[PDB]
Scaffold this active site. Structure first.
Site, PDB file in Angstrom:
ATOM      1  N   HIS B  88       0.846  -1.197   0.000  1.00 31.12           N
ATOM      2  CA  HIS B  88       0.000   0.000   0.000  1.00 31.12           C
ATOM      3  C   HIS B  88       0.885   1.252   0.000  1.00 31.12           C
ATOM      4  O   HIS B  88       2.096   1.185   0.299  1.00 31.12           O
ATOM      5  CB  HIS B  88      -0.901   0.028   1.246  1.00 31.12           C
ATOM      6  CG  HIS B  88      -1.858  -1.128   1.389  1.00 31.12           C
ATOM      7  ND1 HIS B  88      -3.018  -1.187   0.618  1.00 31.12           N
ATOM      8  CD2 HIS B  88      -1.827  -2.235   2.179  1.00 31.12           C
ATOM      9  CE1 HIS B  88      -3.621  -2.348   0.942  1.00 31.12           C
ATOM     10  NE2 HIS B  88      -2.926  -3.019   1.898  1.00 31.12           N
ATOM     11  N   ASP B  91      -1.257   8.951  -1.563  1.00 31.92           N
ATOM     12  CA  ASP B  91      -1.240  10.087  -2.501  1.00 31.92           C
ATOM     13  C   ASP B  91      -2.111  11.196  -1.865  1.00 31.92           C
ATOM     14  O   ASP B  91      -3.349  10.988  -1.704  1.00 31.92           O
ATOM     15  CB  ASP B  91      -1.804   9.639  -3.866  1.00 31.92           C
ATOM     16  CG  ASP B  91      -2.091  10.689  -4.936  1.00 31.92           C
ATOM     17  OD1 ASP B  91      -2.039  11.921  -4.636  1.00 31.92           O
ATOM     18  OD2 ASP B  91      -2.398  10.243  -6.104  1.00 31.92           O
ATOM     19  N   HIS B  93      -3.736  14.778  -2.477  1.00 31.91           N
ATOM     20  CA  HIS B  93      -4.032  15.803  -3.479  1.00 31.91           C
ATOM     21  C   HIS B  93      -3.633  17.220  -3.055  1.00 31.91           C
ATOM     22  O   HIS B  93      -3.605  18.136  -3.877  1.00 31.91           O
ATOM     23  CB  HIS B  93      -5.515  15.787  -3.875  1.00 31.91           C
ATOM     24  CG  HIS B  93      -5.977  14.621  -4.690  1.00 31.91           C
ATOM     25  ND1 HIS B  93      -7.254  14.602  -5.250  1.00 31.91           N
ATOM     26  CD2 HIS B  93      -5.375  13.440  -5.053  1.00 31.91           C
ATOM     27  CE1 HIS B  93      -7.360  13.438  -5.940  1.00 31.91           C
ATOM     28  NE2 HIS B  93      -6.250  12.699  -5.860  1.00 31.91           N
ATOM     29  N   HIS B 128      -5.594   9.213  -0.957  1.00 35.69           N
ATOM     30  CA  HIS B 128      -5.974   7.834  -1.292  1.00 35.69           C
ATOM     31  C   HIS B 128      -4.755   6.976  -1.560  1.00 35.69           C
ATOM     32  O   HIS B 128      -3.679   7.478  -1.915  1.00 35.69           O
ATOM     33  CB  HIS B 128      -6.970   7.797  -2.474  1.00 35.69           C
ATOM     34  CG  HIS B 128      -6.449   8.279  -3.787  1.00 35.69           C
ATOM     35  ND1 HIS B 128      -5.668   7.490  -4.641  1.00 35.69           N
ATOM     36  CD2 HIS B 128      -6.632   9.450  -4.442  1.00 35.69           C
ATOM     37  CE1 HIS B 128      -5.398   8.233  -5.731  1.00 35.69           C
ATOM     38  NE2 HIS B 128      -5.956   9.444  -5.667  1.00 35.69           N
ATOM     39  N   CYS B 129      -4.924   5.644  -1.452  1.00 33.79           N
ATOM     40  CA  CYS B 129      -3.888   4.690  -1.854  1.00 33.79           C
ATOM     41  C   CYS B 129      -3.787   4.668  -3.381  1.00 33.79           C
ATOM     42  O   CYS B 129      -4.785   4.886  -4.092  1.00 33.79           O
ATOM     43  CB  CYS B 129      -4.201   3.320  -1.260  1.00 33.79           C
ATOM     44  SG  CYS B 129      -2.926   2.042  -1.513  1.00 33.79           S
ATOM     45  N   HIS B 139      -7.723  -0.431  -5.105  1.00 33.42           N
ATOM     46  CA  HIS B 139      -7.510  -0.032  -3.706  1.00 33.42           C
ATOM     47  C   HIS B 139      -8.453   1.092  -3.283  1.00 33.42           C
ATOM     48  O   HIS B 139      -8.970   1.114  -2.145  1.00 33.42           O
ATOM     49  CB  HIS B 139      -6.032   0.294  -3.421  1.00 33.42           C
ATOM     50  CG  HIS B 139      -5.122  -0.903  -3.352  1.00 33.42           C
ATOM     51  ND1 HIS B 139      -4.334  -1.151  -2.235  1.00 33.42           N
ATOM     52  CD2 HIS B 139      -4.907  -1.915  -4.238  1.00 33.42           C
ATOM     53  CE1 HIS B 139      -3.658  -2.284  -2.477  1.00 33.42           C
ATOM     54  NE2 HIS B 139      -3.988  -2.776  -3.655  1.00 33.42           N
ATOM     55  N   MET B 144      -9.876   2.711   0.411  1.00 34.25           N
ATOM     56  CA  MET B 144      -8.620   3.354   0.825  1.00 34.25           C
ATOM     57  C   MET B 144      -8.586   4.814   0.363  1.00 34.25           C
ATOM     58  O   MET B 144      -7.821   5.195  -0.551  1.00 34.25           O
ATOM     59  CB  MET B 144      -7.384   2.589   0.345  1.00 34.25           C
ATOM     60  CG  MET B 144      -7.257   1.221   0.925  1.00 34.25           C
ATOM     61  SD  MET B 144      -5.590   0.492   1.001  1.00 34.25           S
ATOM     62  CE  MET B 144      -4.711   1.494   2.157  1.00 34.25           C
ATOM     63  N   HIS B 249     -27.274  17.345  -1.424  1.00 31.63           N
ATOM     64  CA  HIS B 249     -28.461  18.159  -1.159  1.00 31.63           C
ATOM     65  C   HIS B 249     -28.933  17.894   0.273  1.00 31.63           C
ATOM     66  O   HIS B 249     -28.948  16.729   0.725  1.00 31.63           O
ATOM     67  CB  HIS B 249     -29.575  17.785  -2.153  1.00 31.63           C
ATOM     68  CG  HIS B 249     -30.937  18.314  -1.844  1.00 31.63           C
ATOM     69  ND1 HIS B 249     -31.424  19.534  -2.194  1.00 31.63           N
ATOM     70  CD2 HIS B 249     -31.958  17.663  -1.281  1.00 31.63           C
ATOM     71  CE1 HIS B 249     -32.726  19.624  -1.707  1.00 31.63           C
ATOM     72  NE2 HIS B 249     -33.057  18.454  -1.226  1.00 31.63           N
ATOM     73  N   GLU B 273     -29.432  24.908  -3.876  1.00 33.06           N
ATOM     74  CA  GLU B 273     -30.293  23.749  -3.572  1.00 33.06           C
ATOM     75  C   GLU B 273     -29.502  22.433  -3.524  1.00 33.06           C
ATOM     76  O   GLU B 273     -29.631  21.622  -2.593  1.00 33.06           O
ATOM     77  CB  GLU B 273     -31.540  23.621  -4.496  1.00 33.06           C
ATOM     78  CG  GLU B 273     -31.273  23.285  -5.964  1.00 33.06           C
ATOM     79  CD  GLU B 273     -32.476  23.411  -6.882  1.00 33.06           C
ATOM     80  OE1 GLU B 273     -33.559  22.831  -6.579  1.00 33.06           O
ATOM     81  OE2 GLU B 273     -32.334  24.088  -7.967  1.00 33.06           O
ATOM     82  N   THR B 274     -28.637  22.242  -4.529  1.00 35.63           N
ATOM     83  CA  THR B 274     -27.872  21.026  -4.793  1.00 35.63           C
ATOM     84  C   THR B 274     -26.518  21.468  -5.370  1.00 35.63           C
ATOM     85  O   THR B 274     -26.463  22.433  -6.169  1.00 35.63           O
ATOM     86  CB  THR B 274     -28.639  20.116  -5.780  1.00 35.63           C
ATOM     87  OG1 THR B 274     -29.912  19.793  -5.178  1.00 35.63           O
ATOM     88  CG2 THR B 274     -27.851  18.861  -6.157  1.00 35.63           C
ATOM     89  N   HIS B 300     -28.404  13.624  -4.823  1.00 36.58           N
ATOM     90  CA  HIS B 300     -29.716  13.804  -5.475  1.00 36.58           C
ATOM     91  C   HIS B 300     -29.838  13.094  -6.829  1.00 36.58           C
ATOM     92  O   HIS B 300     -30.720  13.462  -7.636  1.00 36.58           O
ATOM     93  CB  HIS B 300     -30.152  15.280  -5.504  1.00 36.58           C
ATOM     94  CG  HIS B 300     -31.633  15.484  -5.376  1.00 36.58           C
ATOM     95  ND1 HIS B 300     -32.576  15.061  -6.316  1.00 36.58           N
ATOM     96  CD2 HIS B 300     -32.365  16.090  -4.382  1.00 36.58           C
ATOM     97  CE1 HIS B 300     -33.796  15.441  -5.867  1.00 36.58           C
ATOM     98  NE2 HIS B 300     -33.740  16.060  -4.682  1.00 36.58           N
TER      99      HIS B 300
HETATM  100 CU   LIG Z   1      -3.797   0.140  -0.720  1.00 42.10          CU
HETATM  101 CU   LIG Z   2     -35.306  16.898  -3.705  1.00 47.54          CU
HETATM  102 CU   LIG Z   3      -5.964  11.024  -6.923  1.00 47.99          CU
END
Ligand SMILES: [Cu+2]
Ligand SMILES: [Cu+2]
Ligand SMILES: [Cu+2]
Ligand SMILES: [Cu+2]
Ligand SMILES: [Cu+2]
Ligand SMILES: [Cu+2]
Lengths: 335, 335, 335
Positions: B88, B91, B93, B128-129, B139, B144, B249, B273-274, B300
């Site tokens: 494993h 990473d 971001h 994330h892995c 993964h 992960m 939402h 709203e969303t 939604h």
């Molecule tokens: Cu992993």
């Molecule tokens: Cu709705």
């Molecule tokens: Cu990524």
């Protein structure tokens, strides 16, 4: 011809490269002349040898990037050689009227047509074939799509009073492809686009692509064909998708300045991890590289990226910055 | 070690809760130390008893939320115990270089590694892995993935010269899961992640999840585990999705201030709203509750929300506001 | 009733048209009264004769557009006639509390209810049925969704100090539909919504619609029912999708001013090719027509647009502008 402006012919180059051009310019409006020659052809799209009935502008997927400035006129000669098998046309999302030009450019094999449009909107824009009815999606997902960039005459800005200038630009065209399978699950081959049509349309309507690729094939922008940069260089990455959404991300980097809807009358967003290209559009991101080494440029549906084809690489030259990142202790046994 | 800053160890807490921290701070940059211990484990994911071969940071889906400030350095000890079965890595971001840290953190069972990165970009970000190749999506969709928040030292603002302060924060991690079925349509069980791999990858490439859940299981953020608030409280809701798009939402509420792309160098949008979380990203929304009672917090696509698992509840305390809403006449026969 | 404001009854009109209303107004707050009568009915949805068990507000898909101003109160009488077969309710995304109104409006066949909410948020918003649990997605994708527009009292603006005024407004409601098929691949028919439920839910959970339509059927906004405009007119196009994402585009035009998240407290984006409607939301775009002739208004997944039903037409009157676009040379043999 009523329009009395100077004319200039520009030669296109194959993606992911972009023909030479100015950002800020002291030139005034002109008529910029381009030629696109349609080519239907059978190509290999993956590492396994799967073949595909492609239809292209200028022999490439995506079609080449055209670059002009606000207030220019763009005059395109579209050629459909007699060796092709069906009719084609062109729709510019940058243009105003006649279904983007599509209603003025339908040509049979053995014909050519000349269309002019005024570049009144700034940004990056899709262009694509659109003959009519069910042929519209089929021509597009067969590869008949590219993009055009319309720059402000003063170049790009950050929305806060500062010029942005790029040191280089790349064009990444993403293609959703629909290759049918037989009853045992193996991909089908065909001897012409017409023969592929029935099975391909049946698959298209189920909405799930078999392949998602950059520059026409799995691995096209990797290895000998990786994208390049130096630490300290500002790189503009234009991304288009004519039919289906995408979510670009630079692994180990960011989008410093991003126009995800792709239009330069809007200020960019800053410091993004991942951005969003709506199907039917082009967007653009600029990044100043800070670290050498390999980067992956992906759609961040990682199944699409790693398993269906949608990964490019950058190989970046320069000196490692241990302030930004460092391996404090290498792998070791757990105490 | 060249870096001469003060060090501070922070203990993580399990989602949807978030470790204690400051918004605006008078502290200067420091090295903030975290530990993540990987755990592969078989879990129950729905009301019916379906099991799932999960792989996790710190035993949870999502992994825990880390909170630091702009200009801090984040030093993580990543541990892969000998009871796990494969390699494993991690990473971030939020980080710059070496594939987010992934190229510096690959560890076999029985190993640990220490990675430091400088927090130069503000916002919420996925981690994330990403071991390499087809292992990357597998993964991630096995569980992960988590997030990190990098706050400005002056706290959050509205882009119009006013401070925003939250009274509490929750972290909602959304997971697309791919559980294979047999020929009669029943979900398959496995005795290890390795045994699940072949069938799981075949399903992943078809792009349709069997389950879409918050906090690792259907109903995880409901009932005894509902989210809580009071009328008058400002609540920040961080939402992440490492692989696939979502559209959050709040049923009966709004997003008062929303960073859908998740990055605090951009002003928030107001009164939504969303909103939209791109796969491969985190975003954030703040809402001041005005009415007591039950709220549902959903994606939604209501099929995903009600039928595939993606619903959380808030139970809010306080007094009903009959000016904002009222039942003028209760159900009655039609005259 | 404690609320001592003037009352006014407004009669709704069927989409894509919109009841008469003011943009900027000199009136103060009032209680605006509407009535919605639910109708379950079997309808034809495509050119081939496929039938569909629809459930509707006021007999239409989408339900009609309500238009009010900021600070108004909206008082709706919801009627469920005795000829219907199951319970229904209403959730307004514009409203605050009680699951948007859903927790105060559940009515059996033979009942009616009266709900009031204060219009404290500006923009376009979805309303939809939401009875509870798995019934929520099923009622929505059966057709039980519409929209409401809450205008500022001073009308719309561009975010830069200028009024925007539209000459007309259209409401385009997009519906994802799930019609099951038998073992030979033919669409199934049913004699009631209850009979359709089991097979429809099984299909819904696989996430792929059989049809994607505007105004309730393939071709509904084409031919005799095309949308109309004149060169020089500013047209507002409200677009909603209660369950699933969409990417609107005007072929041969642009979005001059676009609120893709749909909320007027945010400045619009300018000069777009294609925009994005999140499932569970309404958005809006304004365009000033510059060229006569036919335009297609589509979602720019072109497979959905051309092959699954999601195309509308505009027929625009006026004089062709040869400066913006012109056919320099008609199709001819290649020299
Ligand atoms: Cu992993
Ligand atoms: Cu709705
Ligand atoms: Cu990524
Ligand atoms: Cu073509
Ligand atoms: Cu198009
Ligand atoms: Cu209903």
């Amino acid at each position: 011809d009523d329009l009395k402006l100077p004319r200039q012919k520009v030669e296109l180059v194959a993606p992911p490269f972009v023909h030479a051009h100015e950002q800020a310019t002291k030139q005034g409006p002109k008529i910029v002349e381009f030629k696109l020659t349609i080519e239907e052809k059978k190509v290999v799209i993956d590492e396994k040898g799967t073949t595909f009935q492609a239809m292209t502008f200028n022999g490439s997927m995506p079609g080449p990037l055209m670059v002009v400035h606000e207030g220019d006129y763009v005059e395109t000669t579209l050629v459909n050689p007699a060796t092709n098998t069906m009719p084609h046309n062109i729709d510019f999302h940058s243009a105003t009227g006649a279904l983007g030009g599509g209603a003025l450019t339908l040509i049979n094999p053995g014909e050519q047509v000349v269309l002019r449009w005024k570049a009144t909107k700034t940004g990056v824009f899709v262009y694509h074939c659109a003959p009519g009815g069910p042929m519209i999606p089929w021509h597009v997902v067969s590869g008949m799509n590219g993009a055009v960039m319309v720059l402000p005459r003063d170049g790009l800005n950050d929305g806060k009073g500062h010029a942005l200038k790029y040191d280089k630009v790349y064009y990444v065209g993403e293609q959703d492809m629909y290759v049918p399978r037989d009853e045992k699950g193996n991909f089908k081959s065909y001897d012409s686009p017409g023969e592929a049509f029935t099975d391909t349309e049946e698959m298209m309507k189920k909405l799930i692509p078999s392949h998602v690729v950059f520059n026409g094939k799995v691995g096209a922008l990797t290895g000998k064909n990786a994208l390049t940069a130096n630490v300290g260089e500002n790189v503009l990455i234009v991304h288009s998708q004519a039919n289906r959404d995408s979510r670009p991300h630079l692994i180990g980097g960011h989008g410093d300045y991003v126009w995800e809807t792709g239009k330069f009358g809007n200020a960019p967003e800053v410091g993004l991890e991942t951005w969003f290209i709506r199907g039917g559009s082009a967007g653009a991101a600029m990044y100043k590289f800070m670290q050498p080494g390999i980067y992956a440029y992906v759609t961040h549906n990682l199944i699409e990226a790693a398993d269906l084809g949608a990964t490019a690489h950058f190989k970046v030259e320069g000196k490692w910055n241990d302030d930004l990142m460092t391996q404090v202790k290498a792998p070791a046994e757990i105490p």
